[PDB]
Design a protein around this ligand. Structure first.
Ligand SMILES: Nc1ncnc2c1ncn2[C@@H]1O[C@H](COP(=O)(O)OP(=O)(O)O)[C@@H](O)[C@H]1O
Ligand SMILES: Nc1ncnc2c1ncn2[C@@H]1O[C@H](COP(=O)(O)OP(=O)(O)O)[C@@H](O)[C@H]1O
Ligand SMILES: Nc1cncn1[C@@H]1O[C@H](COP(=O)(O)O)[C@@H](O)[C@H]1O
Ligand SMILES: Nc1cncn1[C@@H]1O[C@H](COP(=O)(O)O)[C@@H](O)[C@H]1O
Ligand SMILES: [Mg+2]
Ligand SMILES: [Mg+2]
Ligand code: NA
Lengths: 381, 376
């Protein structure tokens, strides 16, 4: 009815899985495109999934020929197959938004036309040290070396501190299209989850995030020690970046806070984002519930995106050992107020996002205290 | 690891479903024994499930054979069948405790040995008019005609006896002395290998004999009554062997004293609010309890006032859809549909839990949904 439609999700990792939990609560059929038995398929026992990859032309097209709206839980999808099937199903958010967004360098130039403040950069026309060395004397060291495509979870980033790191950097991001970014000296990082609807623009509070080795680690929601003046500029900034893109759906906005208190965009995501996991226990409508509603033109009471109590989300990243992530979840079993989410991801690879723990509390202070020991254990591994 | 043990659950209705939701978060495998595509199995795509009824000796024996522990999501389960296998698989909570509980008369007699304040009652051996009549004289009217095993009949005076008896024909009974409560109460208790914990006392509301609404916590009920209820609950449940979540329904008497209504040996309707209401739901709590995992006390506390509205089948096989479609627009409304599909009259189709910082506030948001459901 309002829930008879089928939703095609390109990608079926943890994100796709949180989306399915939300789908399941409303009895909306979610057909997933990804490997068999992926995280999302694991909790949706029916026959509509499609086996194959989201960057796969014919797999992308089959999914679409069987669903009323096709969405994505990842950006590195075949937007060409999507333009091809644009006539057979609705796509939200838009294939052009995804195509743009999926190339970081391209995303950025798209936004610069829009006024968006963002770190200086230089594309790398070949992958020579000569080239890099050059760009180095153009924007200084260190600098962030980055792959234009396929990057997520710090996977296409490489900090270059000196000209002596050059070969390692290049090796590291071997055979990928690159660009370098002038350093961003942030006093903190922020993120706003924006929701684009048929007739409205909604958003959650600004949160403070902490990244290490280029990967998100913690999220404090709402953001600590930030004036309502900053929260605000942050929010405007985020809505602006989003308005630059076509589509209904949840959008993730990453910004850096300058020592000067001014704001910079770090990157924009045309999907459900790690920065918003706290919404599950943190608000009445999680980002995941929100996103389905948006792409299905279902209501979204704004009150439901307000934060119920303070919270902190800690990621459970693969460590040196492959058992290691379990030890963290295990410790979480004893943190008061800690909600544990394991991704059913398989082999835990170092740096691999394997699950998250979200801790709430009537006050940050107290949420901070409940979680310390778990960060402590997490830290020593 | 700590989450490599297998859980087999008898039943795959909305209860097993939420129980499955919780294990999927922990990636703990659940083999459900029930029909195919049961609400629960649909959210658990693996091959360990068993197709059958939890009333058939063999379906059951098959499930134990593939689990570490066996638990249940419905009370009417075969406990002799379960008994048989307590040799091959651990059963939590006890088949004995289950067996005792699923008979309300026996459940009742075990609990008097323990001091559980309850209604006086009288066992009907004959299901004869003359026998009932006598009882009535000791107990007074009206009184509650009850089956030990929809199964109740309020009897007002001598004359209703007749109607009252066919009314509960086939079944054996005992009648209960009237309870003049001013409110109904419920406590979700958690029996751990080591302790008996409870979540807060909540107020429950019925309609046509089916839970309709629950107010968490119970409205304008002093802190003392709350704790008294919690105490009584914990104490009755401690009279049982085995681990796991137990739901205890109580009567608040006019004099503010508490009387036990009944105990259910499992995750129970009155506790659904614990999903959005507490850091650890009753589903989360059960899985931990049975598997011996920590259960931090604070995680059992109510984060904010919440109200759960059950979504009950009406006359139309779609109506639940109205309720939920109306709820899409209710502020702070967390919707739970059971994928039971086919709406029949009075069937439990889903539930909605609405939260807010204050109970008054939640009542305000949910009102219209109530009217809605009421309109139909
Ligand atoms: N210019 C930069 N200067 C300093 N640190 C950066 C810069 N760009 C990225 N980072 C750091 O790495 C994190 C992840 O980088 P990002 O560009 O967001 O890639 P990913 O797609 O893999 O998220 C950022 O949150 C920030 O900590
Ligand atoms: N002794 C009693 N006097 C008044 N009402 C009673 C009595 N016993 C049961 N009831 C009412 O009947 C409803 C169902 O009774 P209960 O013993 O819980 O039966 P069931 O297991 O069938 O729900 C109760 O929740 C309460 O309203
Ligand atoms: N982190 C991220 C960025 N873009 C998508 N994801 C999530 O990460 C997945 C899987 O990452 P992994 O490479 O560890 O399997 C995606 O499908 C989605 O759920
Ligand atoms: N109503 C109830 C009573 N005891 C448990 N349940 C739940 O009801 C389900 C089945 O309800 P139905 O008869 O409508 O199919 C059971 O599996 C369990 O979840
Ligand atoms: Mg990022
Ligand atoms: Mg009852
Ligand atoms: Na950092």
């Amino acid at each position: 009815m309002w829930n008879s439609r089928k939703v095609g999700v390109l990608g079926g990792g943890q994100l796709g899985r949180m989306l399915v939990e939300s789908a399941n609560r409303l009895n909306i059929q979610v057909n997933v495109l990804d490997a068999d038995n992926s995280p999302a398929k694991q909790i949706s026992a029916h026959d509509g999934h499609v086996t194959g990859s989201f960057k796969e032309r014919e797999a992308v097209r089959q999914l679409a020929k069987t669903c009323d709206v096709v969405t994505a839980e990842i950006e590195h999808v075949d937007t060409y197959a999507l333009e091809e099937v644009a006539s057979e199903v609705k796509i939200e958010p838009s294939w052009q938004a995804i195509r743009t967004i999926q190339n970081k360098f391209n995303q950025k130039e798209h936004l610069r036309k829009y006024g968006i403040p963002m770190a200086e950069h230089r594309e790398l026309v070949e992958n020579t040290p000569a080239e890099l060395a050059k760009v180095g004397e153009q924007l200084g060291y260190p600098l962030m070396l980055k792959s234009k495509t396929m990057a997520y979870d710090g996977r296409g980033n490489f900090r270059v501190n000196s000209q002596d790191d050059i070969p390692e950097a290049l090796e590291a991001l071997k055979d990928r299209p690159l660009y370098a970014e002038k350093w961003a000296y942030f006093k903190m990082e922020l993120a706003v989850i924006v929701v684009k609807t048929k007739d409205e623009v909604l958003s959650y509070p600004t949160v403070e995030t902490v990244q290490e080795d280029s990967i998100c680690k913690l999220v404090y929601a709402p953001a600590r020690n930030v004036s309502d003046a900053i929260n605000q500029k942050a929010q405007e900034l985020a809505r602006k970046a989003v308005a630059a893109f076509d589509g209904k759906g949840v959008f993730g906005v990453e910004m850096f806070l300058l020592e000067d208190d001014s704001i910079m965009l770090c990157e924009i995501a045309s999907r459900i984002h790690n920065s918003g996991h706290y919404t599950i226990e943190g608000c009445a409508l999680s980002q995941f519930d929100a996103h389905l509603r948006a792409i299905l033109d279902l209501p979204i009471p704004a009150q439901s995106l307000e934060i119920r109590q303070p919270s902190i989300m800690l990621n459970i990243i693969g460590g040196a050992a492959p058992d290691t992530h379990l030890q963290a979840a295990e410790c979480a079993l004893s943190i008061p107020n800690a909600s544990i989410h394991l991704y059913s991801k398989g082999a835990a690879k170092p740096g691999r996002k394997m699950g998250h723990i979200t801790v709430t509390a009537p006050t940050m202070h107290e949420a901070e205290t409940h979680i310390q020991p778990l960060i402590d254990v997490v830290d020593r591994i």
